[PDB]
Amino acid sequence: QRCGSQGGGATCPGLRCCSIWGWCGDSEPYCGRTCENKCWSGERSDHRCGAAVGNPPCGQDRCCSVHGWCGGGNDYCSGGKCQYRCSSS
Numbered sequence: 001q002r003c004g005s006q007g008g009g010a011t012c013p014g015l016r017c018c019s020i021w022g023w024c025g026d027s028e029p030y031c032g033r034t035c036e037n038k039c040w041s042g043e044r045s046d047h048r049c050g051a052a053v054g055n056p057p058c059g060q061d062r063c064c065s066v067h068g069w070c071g072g073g074n075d076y077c078s079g080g081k082c083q084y085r086c087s088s089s
């Protein structure tokens with residue numbers, strides 16, 4: 001959907017990346033160099049995620065588990081274990 005400064009100020013559903021062009025997505029055009037909001041480089045140094053720290057993104061191929069930690073794989077990305085940016089699903 002539309003998002004960010006070029007798409008009426010919306011943040012993407014499921015805390016996905018918003019590209020500098022105002023569209024939501026999950027891939028390098030959305031999340032890498034041409035990312036505006038919730039970009040892969042925005043993950044915290046301590047890797048925390050979730051509402052308590054303002055719902056930061058996670059890096060490339062990492063998900064936000066329901067425990068509040070970014071990381072890769074089934075513990076972090078498989079449904080039930082993942083709260084947002086869920087991968088192995």
Ligand SMILES: CC(=O)N[C@@H]1[C@@H](O)[C@H](O[C@@H]2O[C@H](CO)[C@@H](O[C@@H]3O[C@H](CO)[C@@H](O)[C@H](O)[C@H]3NC(C)=O)[C@H](O)[C@H]2NC(C)=O)[C@@H](CO)O[C@H]1O
Nearest residue numbers: 001002003018019020021022023024025028029030031034
């Ligand atoms: C007007 C235009 O095409 N300008 C270019 C940008 O729009 C383009 O970004 C991509 O734009 C398309 C729309 O043209 C986006 O596709 C839409 O994406 C949403 C999900 O986010 C989906 O629901 C729509 O159905 C889909 N529409 C179409 C027509 O497929 C796409 O997500 C945008 N990609 C990015 C990375 O933002 C950029 C980059 O290609 O270039 C402009 O010139």
